[PDB]
Design a protein around this nucleic acid. Structure first.
Lengths: 77, 112, 17, 100, 71, 50
RNA sequence: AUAUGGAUUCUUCACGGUAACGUAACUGAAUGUGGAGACGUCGGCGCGAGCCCUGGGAGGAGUUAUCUUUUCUUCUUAACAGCUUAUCACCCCGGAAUUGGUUUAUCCGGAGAUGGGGUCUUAUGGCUGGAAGAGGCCAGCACCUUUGCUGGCUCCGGUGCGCUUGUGACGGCCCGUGAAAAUCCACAGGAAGGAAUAGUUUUCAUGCCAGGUCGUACUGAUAACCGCAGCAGGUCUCCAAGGUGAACAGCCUCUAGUUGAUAGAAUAAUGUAGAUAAGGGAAGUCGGCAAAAUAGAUCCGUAACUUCGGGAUAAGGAUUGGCUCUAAGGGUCGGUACGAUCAACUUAGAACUGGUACGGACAAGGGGAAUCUGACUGUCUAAUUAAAACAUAGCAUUGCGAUGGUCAGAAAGUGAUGUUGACGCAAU
RNA sequence: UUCAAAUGAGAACUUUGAAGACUGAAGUGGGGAAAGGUUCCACGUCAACAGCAGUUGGACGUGGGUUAGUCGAUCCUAAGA
């Protein structure tokens, strides 16, 4: 129920030694007045609150997925 | 055109049984019990509500941090910030008056 | 017993004088 | 500022059974669409084209998808066709006629 | 009660009226060598006490329920 | 009601178990004179008065 | 319970802002002080929420002899979290009469207004997370079947003396000024404990464990409660759609819920309930009992008397439909002048029209002239007497200055008035 | 209130469909307090009860059902005891 705006702080939450489940949500949204785009939401389940990070750019969406540790169980959609 | 019922066992419109109508994500109208509203803290002698202090229920004041219940100036969360400055003029002038009255008393028995 | 069976008090009925 | 919207009706399904005529249905929309009041104001606003299997309506005036369904339902009642023909929408602004 | 065993992973037992949730959790934990997640109790209208013992995800209710003998 | 003490609910449980007809096999016993349950209670005819 | 990170400390127990005050943190014992808890009623006004109304668009259903870009329905966002946001209030600059500011309601200003620049409270609202993955509305498929599978859409706005409710700042009223405690916090205070090769704070962030006992079904009433009962009686409270209209009145409808009260066949008398009557109009009767008439709104007009407040809706008259128009009453935007555009039911007026009807059903004061009596509002004989009886304000008398007056108790190291003191209490 | 069908030994009264109506939202709607105590739900039954009837029932017989660290009691005090 908490939103994180920093991508460097987001990577520290994935190695907090207690987070076991993470989810990536793809949202079909649209821009100001024109074409639709691909919105992504990376949600990490902690022990007391759910942290989320939203990226509106598809270029940085794929780059962050490979940066996640492999010990963290990622749930696609 | 949708009516709602109480969510607790109390069927009377008491001061602790207020109801707010809330639209749920399910698409139906549903009542929501709201708590009695908090009152702002008041100053000890002027009666006005001092600023800078959060307005909460007394027992949930122990959960908020220190900065929400006090002001960095002395007599912060008790006085009106003009009540403090009023008792500084009085504390400085009276003690200055109490020592110039002590030398007037000295004038009497030293010259009679 | 009820509102009927009136015999006792009376305006001009029985049990007068 | 007044970009037009295209409405396409699929007429392939009922015409294979022989009970529907695309040319007769297309003319019904010409003399029944009301623009700025009464009938007969298609001043480069509404155009109806057909190729024999689909009817395409391109309108730049006030013309919604509910008005197209309302006029089509009146055409089927005139020809006594509101018991094997429905006016459904496969997607946005693209309609079809289901015979079944 | 048996319908809850296969899907809810909840065992239903009859419990003495003097026992509380600590004693039910302790007795089940060693009489059947299981782990108890939560205990829910109620007083039945006939004067008895019914307890809903839910096991953790490490154990299953069905293969333990027939270990006592009832099914 | 519906918010009652345990003492009231404990007496309601005893009355539920006593609401039963006479068992059939008792009537076949030797020197048996009981023919029906004479202490039967119903909520429509007699209130139990707590 | 303790740990990790952060913060502070060699100026030992933090910095910034003139100020209001601000921050992720940033030792505080005995004791003292303050605040919250913690409060009447009515009135209008501002704001918010839900509902009502409505436009565009995307779906589904209804009607179609004729008409109707039509009628109906779906388009939803919880607790909680982060940021932000206002009336009031406060601070700094400044020094006002040619007095200014300002509310629906007249209060404020050299005890510092108007103005300029800021601070704070976060009820509430706004955005984001929660959260579409949900729910909802449809389409396309599979098929005895466990029954699913696959696609879509779920959008953007407007309006108000509206209804319900919450709240804010005020005003009116009192010989009535309209609870208490548990509990929580702050401040004052400076007792103690503490750094340099190292410490302290779990009111900073994160992580760990645990949260027992009892109630929980249903009815809540023309059948589940009390009345001898499956009795037209009695019994506390919350939620409140559309039209007509001043209206939570009466009347009709939507959601929701019922169609349950022994039936059938005939239509005599007498009944109960509802009605209508020519001519006369209280001749009836102890008695205008009962019934009838009057009735809403707008305009005109309104006596004797009076404590000058009333009487008064006095009495007494006229108008009221439909349709077609006219006039008046506003909001928002760029300028030292005027337009453009948008949105409300309120009032007034004029023609035309009719079997002269028009508060067309519903709803809805009879009035006047005098006497007796009580001043009035109010109260009582539950189940025959609601009154001129009681009470009332006003007026008057009496007792009492506490070792006392009045009254209670078997007694009492006992009480009521009395948390009282003659503008009081007690007795008439 | 009416028609048809179903069930049944048996239907003016049960169930379903259709039609006509009413309560008109200060309701014959949806919830609770006091009170009742299993009336709640399912299956089976029609001797008695439902002042007619009954295949139906708040009836009879047999079983099922009430899950809380966050809702209440528990705690505080009022008039008082």
């Amino acid at each position: 129920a908490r939103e994180i705006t920093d991508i460097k702080q987001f990577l520290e939450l994935t190695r907090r030694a207690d987070v076991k489940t993470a989810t990536v949500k793809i949202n079909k949204k649209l821009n100001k007045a024109g074409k639709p785009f691909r919105q992504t939401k990376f949600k990490v389940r902690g022990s007391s609150s759910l942290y989320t990070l939203v990226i509106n750019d598809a270029g940085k969406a794929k780059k962050l997925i490979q940066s996640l540790p492999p010990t963290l169980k990622v749930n696609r959609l | 055109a949708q009516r709602v019922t109480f969510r607790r066992r109390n069927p009377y419109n008491t001061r602790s049984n207020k109801i707010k109508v809330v639209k749920t994500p399910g698409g139906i109208l549903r009542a929501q019990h709201v708590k009695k509203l908090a009152t702002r803290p008041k100053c000890g002698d002027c009666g006005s509500a001092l600023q800078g202090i959060s307005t909460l229920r007394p027992r949930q004041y122990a959960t908020v941090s220190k900065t929400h219940k006090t002001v960095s100036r002395a007599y912060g969360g008790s006085r009106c910030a003009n009540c403090v400055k009023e008792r500084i003029i009085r504390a400085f002038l009276i003690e200055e008056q109490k020592i110039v009255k002590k030398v007037v008393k000295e004038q009497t028995e030293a010259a009679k | 017993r009820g509102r009927g069976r009136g015999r006792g008090r009376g305006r001009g009925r029985g049990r007068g004088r | 500022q007044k970009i037009a919207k295209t409405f396409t009706v699929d007429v392939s399904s009922p015409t294979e059974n022989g009970v529907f005529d695309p040319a007769s249905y297309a003319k019904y929309l010409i003399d029944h669409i009301k623009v700025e009041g009464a009938v007969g104001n298609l001043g480069n606003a509404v155009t109806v084209t057909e190729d024999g299997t689909v009817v395409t309506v391109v309108s730049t005036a006030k013309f919604s998808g509910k008005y197209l369904k309302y006029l089509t339902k009146k055409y089927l009642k005139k020809n006594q066709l509101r018991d094997w023909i429905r006016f459904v929408s496969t997607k946005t602004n693209e309609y079809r006629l289901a015979f079944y | 009660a048996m319908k809850k065993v296969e899907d809810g992973n909840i065992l239903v037992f009859q419990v003495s009226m003097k026992a509380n949730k600590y004693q039910i959790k302790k007795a089940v934990k060693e009489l059947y060598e299981v782990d108890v997640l939560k205990v829910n109790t109620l007083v039945r209208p006939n004067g008895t006490k019914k307890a809903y013992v839910r096991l953790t995800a490490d154990y299953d209710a069905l293969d333990i329920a027939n270990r006592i003998g009832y099914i | 009601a519906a918010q009652k003490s345990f003492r009231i609910k404990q007496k309601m449980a005893k009355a539920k178990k006593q609401n039963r007809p006479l068992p059939q096999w008792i009537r076949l016993r030797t020197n048996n004179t009981i023919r029906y349950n004479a202490k039967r209670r119903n909520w429509r005819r007699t209130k139990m008065n707590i």
